[PDB]
Design an enzyme around this catalytic site. Sequence first.
Site, PDB file in Angstrom:
ATOM      1  N   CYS A 244      -1.481   2.667 -11.529  1.00  0.00           N
ATOM      2  CA  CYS A 244      -2.323   1.475 -10.199  1.00  0.00           C
ATOM      3  C   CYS A 244      -3.869   1.335 -10.719  1.00  0.00           C
ATOM      4  CB  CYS A 244      -1.639   1.689  -8.936  1.00  0.00           C
ATOM      5  SG  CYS A 244       0.187   1.470  -9.204  1.00  0.00           S
TER       6      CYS A 244
ATOM      7  N   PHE B 211       0.801  -1.120   0.182  1.00  0.00           N
ATOM      8  CA  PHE B 211      -0.038   0.559  -0.536  1.00  0.00           C
ATOM      9  C   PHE B 211       0.935   1.238   0.375  1.00  0.00           C
ATOM     10  CE2 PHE B 211      -2.311  -3.356   2.185  1.00  0.00           C
ATOM     11  CZ  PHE B 211      -3.929  -3.799   1.537  1.00  0.00           C
ATOM     12  N   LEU B 212       2.013   1.249  -0.884  1.00  0.00           N
ATOM     13  CA  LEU B 212       2.856   2.231  -0.986  1.00  0.00           C
ATOM     14  C   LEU B 212       2.164   3.255  -2.340  1.00  0.00           C
ATOM     15  CD1 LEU B 212       5.705  -0.152  -1.088  1.00  0.00           C
ATOM     16  CD2 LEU B 212       4.518   0.939   1.138  1.00  0.00           C
TER      17      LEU B 212
ATOM     18  N   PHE C 291      -9.862  11.843  -1.614  1.00  0.00           N
ATOM     19  CA  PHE C 291     -10.553  11.693  -2.515  1.00  0.00           C
ATOM     20  C   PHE C 291     -11.646  11.770  -2.619  1.00  0.00           C
ATOM     21  CE2 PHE C 291      -6.832   8.510  -4.359  1.00  0.00           C
ATOM     22  CZ  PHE C 291      -6.137   9.018  -3.374  1.00  0.00           C
TER      23      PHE C 291
HETATM   24  O1  LIG Z   1      -1.348   0.578  -5.474  1.00  0.00           O
HETATM   25  C1  LIG Z   1      -0.216   1.024  -5.092  1.00  0.00           C
HETATM   26  O2  LIG Z   1       0.872   0.704  -5.515  1.00  0.00           O
HETATM   27  C2  LIG Z   1      -0.759   2.572  -4.604  1.00  0.00           C
HETATM   28  O3  LIG Z   1      -2.121   3.262  -6.098  1.00  0.00           O
HETATM   29  C3  LIG Z   1      -2.235   4.652  -5.163  1.00  0.00           C
HETATM   30  O4  LIG Z   1      -1.369   5.457  -5.696  1.00  0.00           O
HETATM   31  P1  LIG Z   1      -0.534   6.310  -6.851  1.00  0.00           P
HETATM   32  O5  LIG Z   1      -1.210   5.906  -7.619  1.00  0.00           O
HETATM   33  O6  LIG Z   1       0.884   6.490  -6.471  1.00  0.00           O
HETATM   34  O7  LIG Z   1      -1.534   7.809  -5.759  1.00  0.00           O
HETATM   35  P2  LIG Z   1      -2.998   8.561  -6.071  1.00  0.00           P
HETATM   36  O8  LIG Z   1      -2.379   9.746  -4.531  1.00  0.00           O
HETATM   37  O9  LIG Z   1      -3.655   7.158  -4.917  1.00  0.00           O
HETATM   38  O10 LIG Z   1      -3.625   9.343  -6.949  1.00  0.00           O
HETATM   39  C4  LIG Z   1      -4.454   8.136  -8.373  1.00  0.00           C
HETATM   40  C5  LIG Z   1      -5.078   9.527  -9.715  1.00  0.00           C
HETATM   41  O11 LIG Z   1      -5.873   9.908  -8.886  1.00  0.00           O
HETATM   42  C6  LIG Z   1      -6.001  11.412  -9.238  1.00  0.00           C
HETATM   43  N1  LIG Z   1      -6.964  12.099  -7.940  1.00  0.00           N
HETATM   44  C7  LIG Z   1      -6.288  11.434  -6.361  1.00  0.00           C
HETATM   45  C8  LIG Z   1      -7.358  12.090  -5.795  1.00  0.00           C
HETATM   46  C9  LIG Z   1      -8.218  12.627  -6.295  1.00  0.00           C
HETATM   47  O12 LIG Z   1      -9.408  13.064  -4.677  1.00  0.00           O
HETATM   48  N2  LIG Z   1      -8.622  13.135  -7.647  1.00  0.00           N
HETATM   49  C10 LIG Z   1      -7.548  12.848  -8.500  1.00  0.00           C
HETATM   50  O13 LIG Z   1      -8.184  12.584  -9.236  1.00  0.00           O
HETATM   51  C11 LIG Z   1      -4.350  12.172  -9.330  1.00  0.00           C
HETATM   52  O14 LIG Z   1      -4.321  12.671  -9.839  1.00  0.00           O
HETATM   53  C12 LIG Z   1      -3.611  10.118  -9.423  1.00  0.00           C
HETATM   54  O15 LIG Z   1      -3.836  10.712 -11.027  1.00  0.00           O
HETATM   55  C13 LIG Z   1      -3.357   4.690  -4.071  1.00  0.00           C
HETATM   56  O16 LIG Z   1      -3.408   5.866  -3.736  1.00  0.00           O
HETATM   57  C14 LIG Z   1      -1.785   3.527  -3.127  1.00  0.00           C
HETATM   58  O17 LIG Z   1      -2.751   3.736  -1.981  1.00  0.00           O
HETATM   59  C15 LIG Z   1      -1.788   1.995  -3.409  1.00  0.00           C
HETATM   60  O18 LIG Z   1      -1.022   1.639  -2.874  1.00  0.00           O
END
Ligand SMILES: O=C(O)[C@H]1O[C@H](OP(=O)(O)OP(=O)(O)OC[C@H]2O[C@@H](n3ccc(=O)[nH]c3=O)[C@H](O)[C@@H]2O)[C@H](O)[C@@H](O)[C@@H]1O
Lengths: 454, 455
Positions: free
Chosen positions: B268, B153-154, B257
């Site tokens: 991911c 869960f990184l 989120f």
């Molecule tokens: O499977 C994984 O290794 C990781 O995948 C995601 O992490 P990540 O994809 O690195 O980053 P996020 O911060 O989750 O962002 C994902 C996408 O959602 C977008 N986002 C996020 C939050 C939000 O409110 N709105 C939104 O559009 C971000 O801009 C980004 O494009 C999960 O957050 C982690 O918990 C998980 O461990």
Amino acid sequence: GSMNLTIIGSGYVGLVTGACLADIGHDVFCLDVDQAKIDILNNGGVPIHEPGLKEVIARNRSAGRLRFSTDIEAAVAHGDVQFIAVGTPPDLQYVLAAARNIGRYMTGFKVIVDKSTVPVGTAERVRAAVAEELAKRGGDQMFSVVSNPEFLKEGAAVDDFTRPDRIVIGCDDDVPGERARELMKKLYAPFNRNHERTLYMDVRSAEFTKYAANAMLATRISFMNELANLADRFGADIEAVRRGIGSDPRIGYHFLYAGCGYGGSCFPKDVEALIRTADEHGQSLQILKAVSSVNATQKRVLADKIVARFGEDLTGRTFAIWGLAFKPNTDDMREAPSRELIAELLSRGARIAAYDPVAQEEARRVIALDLADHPSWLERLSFVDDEAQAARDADALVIVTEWKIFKSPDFVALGRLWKTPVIFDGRNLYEPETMSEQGIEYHPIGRPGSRQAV
Amino acid sequence: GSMNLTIIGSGYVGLVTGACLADIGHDVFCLDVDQAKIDILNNGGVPIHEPGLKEVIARNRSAGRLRFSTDIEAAVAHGDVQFIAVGTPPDEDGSADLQYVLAAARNIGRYMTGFKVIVDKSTVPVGTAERVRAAVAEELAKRMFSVVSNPEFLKEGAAVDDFTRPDRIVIGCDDDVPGERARELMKKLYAPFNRNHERTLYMDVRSAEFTKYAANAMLATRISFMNELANLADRFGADIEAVRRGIGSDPRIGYHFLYAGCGYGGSCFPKDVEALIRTADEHGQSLQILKAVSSVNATQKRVLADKIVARFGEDLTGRTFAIWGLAFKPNTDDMREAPSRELIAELLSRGARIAAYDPVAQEEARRVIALDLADHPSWLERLSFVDDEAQAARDADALVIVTEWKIFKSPDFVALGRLWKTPVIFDGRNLYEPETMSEQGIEYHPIGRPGSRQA
Ligand SMILES: O=C(O)[C@H]1O[C@H](OP(=O)(O)OP(=O)(O)OC[C@H]2O[C@@H](n3ccc(=O)[nH]c3=O)[C@H](O)[C@@H]2O)[C@H](O)[C@@H](O)[C@@H]1O
Ligand SMILES: O=C(O)[C@H]1O[C@H](OP(=O)(O)OP(=O)(O)OC[C@H]2O[C@@H](n3ccc(=O)[nH]c3=O)[C@H](O)[C@@H]2O)[C@H](O)[C@@H](O)[C@@H]1O
């Protein structure tokens, strides 16, 4: 400190709002046009299943802070702030009629508060209606329409009102809007003595918020119900998955219980309303359509599992039903999954013995209506006063509503009553391994069944 | 308390897991077949953009708790617990390739003596642990163990913190005697993280495998839910950020989120929701909600270009757009599934010139966008990358914000005013207040809110 308030609508939202605002020191006039309901309230009765409400009404009536009347003119003159809390049955004529009565009689500034759940844009229609009444009278009177949705839960409404998570206030920012916002701030001051609980926004966004909140809660439930179905295919346990994802603070632990679907008079109505009005505005809400579709199918899952287990013809079979109300702690039967289950089973020839700690009378009423076209099916439906008695000669027990009394039952006593030890659980009350160890063939939602089930 | 551990896979999940487990006192062997990578690591180098990682590695190499080697047999012999943390790169089919996890499983079974716990740490489909078990038993047959699911869960760019302070640790183990033996070893392994607060959640193997996908699917669902409501907010004249405050303040929903914008990216969310959809379809189940969330995210990635076309016309020849943000999220160079790639392709396809800036992702973006648009060298000639954020706005018809790097939250409008052709901003991350933009004479087009008066 204290303000003169009027609540229009002596229904559930209106009664709780009016009674609790009187209880913090405001002077409250509760208006309803229905003399019968008003009479019932003035004789110390309460038309709803609401813990603590009768005693709040009682002490405030005695203190002279709460009055119940059908007198529309007296209601308009009393209240500087007018809460519209009237129903909107499957129709805004009542909120608009309330608005017109305020406009026809008001003689000074009024804050008109849309408290009933109403579609976005309603506050503008209320404003137009009041304005046109004022123009007939030639008066200079000023007013503002505020959106202040309700976030009460039936059966917990007094506590939800008294300790809210937040208070949403949508107000205009023109001169009358700011005057109204100041009055709302004064009105809710006693709830803001610690953390600020009021959230101020524009009127349309406050109207949208109420629908969006219920839509997200419904989405959580249907999301888990789709995954529960997939867990069965995977050999996974949706309760383990629930803890596994709920433990991420960005998700949270609540409203992730898979089961036999959501009912009530709120979620289905608010989800469907949002889908319908989006479509009318040229937008298809794909996620909410899916959520609603999932829920419709999920309310058939118990009967489907029963048919898979016993066959399409249930003549000669008896099913005990535990739980009738749409959720625990209410007698409310609106959109209750139990109604769909019982109709399905009766249609196939089954006999049904049903139990609910509080909802027996309401269930009898509405199911007799549901199945009015099949009097012969109703002859096979009975209601019992004790949970274990429902299981007498039953082929299986079916759990629909997670009342606490069902959480630790006497399985020994059940074992002496039922025909076969089979349980279909639409609310995942028990551990499968424990049911195995007790010789029960257990069919939960999204979890491996007991070994007897397998 | 110290155990001897092997991490297979010297990639991102492997390096953080290995280095931080060494850091709590375990003796860790990090295995990878790529000698070039093992070399870069043993030279004090680190292949990824990950704050704090190099220091943790250096400290633990010195303490004699962290080794890097390509030596397979040595790896299998060292590790009482064998973490499989290798990649699962897509195929041309776009499904994750399990060949490297199974190759690792087979190697364990070929050389193992005595009991092993085999831990599936890289994200793998439900049922993978059973394939791993069978592959290990295959190799043993020719010549006792248990396979555990322990998902990661990184978050890229914050992985060291995420590992060191987890919200929870998920451990999926079997109910039998080898499974019970593995469970106790996992408890001991993670003892330091549970010292003051119990953080481990134990469940069966398949539920743990499912949990990882389910978690990312729910996060993606929250985002698409808000993006669909953002589009509706425009139709209603409502403000999606007010709606966010209004619903996130219900603690059953929570505040995280719920930020509407130009969509989600990364390696991911799209991968994991697609994987669920595909596997479900292969078991004859249509995941209606996840199919809708994926569909809305595909549409949302078109919204910025749509707005730009509405404002300037369908032919953008003779227009220049500045783009702020390239990485799929802030604080990484990762360009996988980045919304910026779709936006830039759409604008260039219409004749626009583009000048793009990102604090760290410029090299990756150039690399990956050149691949995306390999069939259109004339489009690539109209794309440039600038090293200073204001410089991207030189002669620009509009600035487009795609990734909410902290630097962008405090624009220098005097610098921008010395450079751009017209003061127009399209904001896919809702960084600014529309009223404030009105005050500055900026024509502002956010997602799901009314824009500035000029807009
Ligand atoms: O499977 C994984 O290794 C990781 O995948 C995601 O992490 P990540 O994809 O690195 O980053 P996020 O911060 O989750 O962002 C994902 C996408 O959602 C977008 N986002 C996020 C939050 C939000 O409110 N709105 C939104 O559009 C971000 O801009 C980004 O494009 C999960 O957050 C982690 O918990 C998980 O461990
Ligand atoms: O609009 C309203 O007046 C109210 O609607 C709901 O309250 P309610 O419908 O009374 O009760 P819930 O506890 O939300 O239950 C709704 C349905 O969802 C089901 N449910 C709930 C939670 C869950 O995890 N799974 C699940 O299937 C319940 O069994 C029930 O059938 C909301 O919870 C209140 O916040 C809102 O104010």
